[PDB]
Design a protein around this ligand. Structure first.
Ligand SMILES: CC[C@H](C)CN(C[C@@H](O)[C@H](Cc1ccccc1)NC(=O)c1cccc(O)c1)S(=O)(=O)c1ccc(-c2ccno2)s1
Lengths: 99, 99
């Protein structure tokens, strides 16, 4: 689709058979989801945003379907204010900015 | 233009006599610029992201040129690590997300 920006670009994602709302976030390098359970081995990681650094759990090669487009990649789980889809997965689904 | 998201979507913006690199950021409701002493009235605000909150000064009806496109609107000025063009100005320059 084409998505305009008068509203937050929130989309439904499917991950582990669960439906969540996430923000398409071109200013985020990474995809960061609020606390949830994901299976498999994870690595402790730290990431930085506008307010400083937080600790997250890094899961690799997690499938997410974003608006019906399939991605498989790195998902960080931790205290983000909202679920965000970052550039690592935006590139996989062919998302671009256009003006 | 079309901007892919393999790298950060940094573009040149102009604010008065200052040229800066800023993120085209669909995850940002409003534009946030690095500390700078802009003329005119403003109001303090707290904005939250990854890591917590920062305090900013909200200026309204500030003209910003973004890749030659004219915009005018709210700009939040504070101790952000990166200049951020938010949805409030992205819409004005005709920026959409596409996939
Ligand atoms: C709540 C949703 C967002 C977290 C809001 N922010 C916009 C993000 O795109 C942010 C941009 C960023 C990039 C690099 C360093 C610091 C920040 N990215 C990130 O936080 C980021 C950057 C790099 C890697 C990563 O894993 C995350 S944000 O930066 O916190 C933000 C912008 C405008 C906001 C607002 C609130 C009310 N009115 O306006 S809140």
């Amino acid at each position: 689709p084409q998505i305009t920006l008068w509203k937050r670009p929130l989309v439904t994602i499917r991950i582990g058979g669960q439906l969540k709302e996430a923000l398409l976030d071109t200013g985020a390098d990474d995809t960061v989801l609020e606390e949830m359970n994901l299976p498999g081995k994870w690595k402790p990681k730290m990431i930085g945003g506008i307010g400083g650094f937080i600790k997250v759990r890094q899961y690799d090669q997690i499938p997410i379907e974003i608006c019906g487009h399939k991605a498989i990649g790195t998902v960080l789980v931790g205290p983000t204010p909202v679920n965000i889809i970052g550039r690592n997965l935006l590139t996989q689904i062919g998302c671009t900015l256009n003006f």
